[PDB]
């Protein structure tokens, strides 16, 4: 039995995780949902508790703690350990009855819970790409200390890449470890992109495109922030850096390719030039499930891929003139140091300004470029706690710098 905790159980990753766990458990009892953790959605956590009956419930916000306790009394034959805040999260991470932790929380609490999952030598199914981009050095250092911890990628392209690898090789290394690509005989990565809603726009059309245009065309339904990143292709820019850190692939060996059908989820070229790819309908249940079953697979009742019906798969190179965020991401990654931290932080601000109709499409990349140009490389801290503080300081500086650039031009 696979003992799982879900952090951010009411968000998109968390709900998809529970959906595929539910369906797989109908076929064979494979998963024990041991713990659920949410910020403040007490009623939604209660409904999940009633169905899954986890040993642990944790809610971050103290103001709904007593309500959760009273709601849980209604459930028959059920006496969970009901916990609160960062201390509850740490208790869940340290439990000997939990093997795998799904991190479906964004922002700092995602990184913080990832840190504690790694410190307790757990398998960590990580969906939060911003944490890998911003704090990749820190995660690498931490995984080198806590040698039985493993990050398994959930981001769909990185799951695809991971699924293209021979586990006879993967098991002799792990993600975020130096020489991962060499041990797995990886030569090059094709990183697939939907292209986003603006993929066919002219430069003149891009100049005054708005957030409404990005949001009101959802071919895949997803959150506002990632939708804007998909529109600018900064999502793929971040994913390039995510690929570099997860798999130790050189930036010159990562190619972004626009695959509008979203069937092939990414491809790995090996040193012999044979290419392996992973394919399915766009459905986050497969990447999430693989993160929890790896190195095995289990039966699902998902719709089988009908390739004949799909009929055509297409690929083209993205235009860097139309999607300058892609170039900025490569430049930041190649520069190294804390430039990825700065890229991510400045994008956080610029994305949100565009989302709220404060700046235009090309202002996004302008702001990010200016913050990157402003940044000065720092000596990388040797101590993990100092390094974390350094990352947070630079993240905060870069957000403030982006906001300051906006305030001056406004």
Ligand X SMILES: Cc1ccc(CCC[C@H](CC(=O)N(C)O)CP(=O)(O)O)cc1
Annotated ligand binding at 273? The verdict is no
- Does the annotation list 235 as a binding residue? yes
Name residues contacting Mn ion, limited to 156-185 (CB under 5 A). 156-157
Rounded Cα–Cα distance for residues 381 and 395 (Å): 15
Among all chains, which residue has been given the structure tokens 């993600």? 175
CB nearer to ligand X: pick between 15 and 370: 15
Judged by beta carbon distances under 5 to 8 A according to partner kind, the member of ligand X, its own copies, Mn ion, none in contact with residue 268 is: none
Is 244 among the residues that bind ligand X (CB under 6 A)?
no
Among 287, 318, 324, 333, binds ligand X (CB under 6 A): 287
Q: What single DSSP character describes residue 74?
A: T
Cross-strand bridge partners of residue 83: 58
Q: Which is nearer to Mn ion, 119 or 222 (CB)?
A: 222
Q: Which 3 state secondary structure label does DSSP give 28?
A: coil
* Phi-psi map region of 96: left, alpha, beta (phi>0 left; psi -120 to 50 alpha): alpha
Q: Annotated binding residue at 86?
A: no
| Residues in touch with its own copies (CB under 8 A) | 163-164, 166-169, 171, 185, 187-188, 190, 257, 264, 267, 269-280, 286, 289-290, 293, 295-300, 302-305, 307-308, 310-317
Cross-strand partners of 264: 279
Options 14-22, 23-31, 282-290, 291-299: segment touching ligand X (CB under 6 A): 282-290
Q: In angstroms, rounded to a whole number, what is the distance separating the alpha carbons of residues 229 and 222?
A: 11
| Cβ-based neighbours of 4, under 8 Å, separated by 6 or more | 17, 21, 31, 32, 33, 34, 35, 98, 99, 100, 101, 102, 292
Instruction: Please indicate if the annotation marks 321 as binding a ligand.
Output: no
CA distance 348 to 332: 15
Rule CB under 6 A: say whether 235 interacts with ligand X: yes
Residue 256: strand pairing partners: 191
State the Cα–Cα distance between residues 108 and 375, nearest whole angstrom. 22
134 assigned ligand-binding residue: no
CA atoms of 256 and 247, how far apart (whole Å): 16
Contact partner at residue 237 from Mn ion, its own copies, ligand X, none, CB < 5 to 8 Å by partner kind: none
List C-alpha distances in Å: 207 to 31, 93, 193, 233, 408. 49, 47, 22, 15, 21
Stretch that binds ligand X, among 85-93, 144-152, 154-162, 369-377 (CB under 6 A): 154-162
Alpha-carbon distance of 276 to 165, in angstroms, equals: 8
Backbone angles phi, psi at 230, to 5 degrees: -65, -40
Q: Which of residues 129-158 bind Mn ion (CB under 5 A)?
A: 155-157
Q: Which does 193 bind (CB under 5 to 8 A by kind): Mn ion, its own copies, ligand X, none?
A: ligand X
- Classified as helix, coil or strand, 317 is coil
* Cross-sheet strand order for the sheet of 100-103: 81-84, 56-59, 31-38, 2-7, 100-103, 123-126, 150-153
Could you give the CA distance from residue 332 to residue 322 in angstroms, rounded to a whole number?
A: 18
The verdict on whether residue 223 carries a ligand-binding annotation is yes
By the rule CB under 6 A, 283 interacts with ligand X = yes
How near is the Cβ of 27 to its own copies at its closest, in Å?
Answer: 10
What's the min distance (Å) between Cβ of 196 and its own copies?
17
Contacts to ligand X from residues 259-278, by CB under 6 A: 262, 265
Shortest Å, Cβ 304 to its own copies:
6
Q: Which is nearer to Mn ion, 156 or 352 (CB)?
A: 156
Query: Residues touching Mn ion: how many (CB under 5 A)?
Result: 3
Smaller CB distance to its own copies: residue 274 or 356? 274
Residue 51 is assigned to a ligand binding site: no
Q: Under rule CB under 6 A, which residues in 155-214 are in contact with ligand X?
A: 155-157, 193-196
Question: What is the rounded CA–CA span in Å between residue 280 and residue 61?
Answer: 38
Q: Helices 224-232 and 361-374 meet at what angle, rounded to 10? A: 90
Among 126, 57, 54, which Cα is nearest to 91's?
57
Distance, CA of 10 to CA of 88 (rounded, Å)? 17
Asked whether position 114 contacts ligand X by CB under 6 A, the answer is: no
Nearer to ligand X, 97 or 319 (CB): 319
**Annotation: binding site for 1-deoxy-D-xylulose 5-phosphate:** 129, 156-157, 194, 217, 230, 235-236, 239
Residues that bind Mn ion (CB under 5 A): 155-157
**Annotation: binding site:** 10-13, 39-41, 129-130, 155-157, 194, 217, 223, 230, 235-236, 239
Residues that bind ligand X (CB under 6 A): 155-157, 193-196, 219-220, 230, 235-236, 262, 265, 282-284, 287
**Annotation: binding site for NADP(+):** 10-13, 39-41, 130, 223
**Annotation: binding site for Mn(2+):** 155, 157, 239
């Amino acid at each position: 039995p696979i003992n799982v905790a879900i952090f951010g159980s009411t968000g998109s990753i968390g709900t998809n995780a529970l959906n595929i766990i539910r369906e797989c458990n109908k076929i064979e009892n494979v998963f024990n949902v041991k713990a659920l953790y949410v910020n403040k959605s007490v009623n939604e956590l209660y409904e999940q508790a009633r169905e899954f009956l986890p040993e642990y419930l944790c809610i971050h916000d103290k103001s709904v703690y007593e309500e959760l306790k009273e709601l849980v009394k209604n459930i028959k034959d059920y006496k969970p350990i009901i916990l609160c805040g960062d201390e509850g999260m740490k208790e869940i991470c340290s439990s000997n009855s939990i093997d795998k932790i799904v991190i479906g929380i964004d922002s700092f609490q995602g990184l913080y819970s990832t840190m504690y999952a790694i410190m307790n030598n757990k398998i960590v199914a990580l969906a939060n790409k911003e944490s890998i981009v911003s704090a990749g050095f820190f995660l690498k250092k931490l995984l080198n200390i806590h040698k039985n911890a493993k990050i398994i990628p959930v981001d769909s392209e990185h799951s695809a890449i991971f699924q293209c690898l021979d586990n006879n090789k993967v098991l002799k290394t792990k993600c975020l470890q130096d020489n991962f690509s060499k041990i797995n005989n990886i030569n090059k990565i094709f990183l697939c992109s939907s292209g986003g809603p603006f993929q066919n726009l002219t430069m003149d059309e891009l100049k005054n495109v708005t957030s409404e245009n990005a949001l009101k065309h959802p071919k895949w339904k997803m959150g506002k922030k990632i939708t804007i990143d998909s529109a600018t292709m900064m999502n793929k820019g971040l994913e390039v850096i995510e690929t570099h850190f997860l798999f130790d692939v050189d930036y010159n060996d990562i190619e972004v390719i626009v695959h509008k059908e979203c069937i092939i989820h990414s491809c790995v070229e090996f040193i012999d030039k044979s290419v392996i790819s992973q394919m399915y309908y766009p459905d986050m249940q497969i990447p999430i499930l693989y993160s929890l079953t790896w190195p095995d697979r289990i039966k699902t009742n998902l719709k089988p891929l009908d390739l004949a019906q799909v009929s055509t798969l297409t690929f083209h190179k993205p235009s860097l003139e139309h999607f300058p965020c892609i170039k900025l991401a490569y430049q930041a990654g190649i520069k190294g140091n804390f430039y990825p931290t700065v890229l991510n932080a400045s994008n956080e601000i610029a994305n949100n300004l565009f989302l709220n109709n404060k700046i235009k499409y090309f202002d996004i990349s302008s702001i990010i470029s200016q913050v990157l140009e402003s940044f000065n490389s720092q000596k990388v801290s040797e101590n993990s706690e100092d390094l974390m503080k350094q990352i947070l300081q630079i993240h905060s500086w870069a957000k403030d710098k982006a906001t300051d650039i906006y305030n001056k031009h406004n």
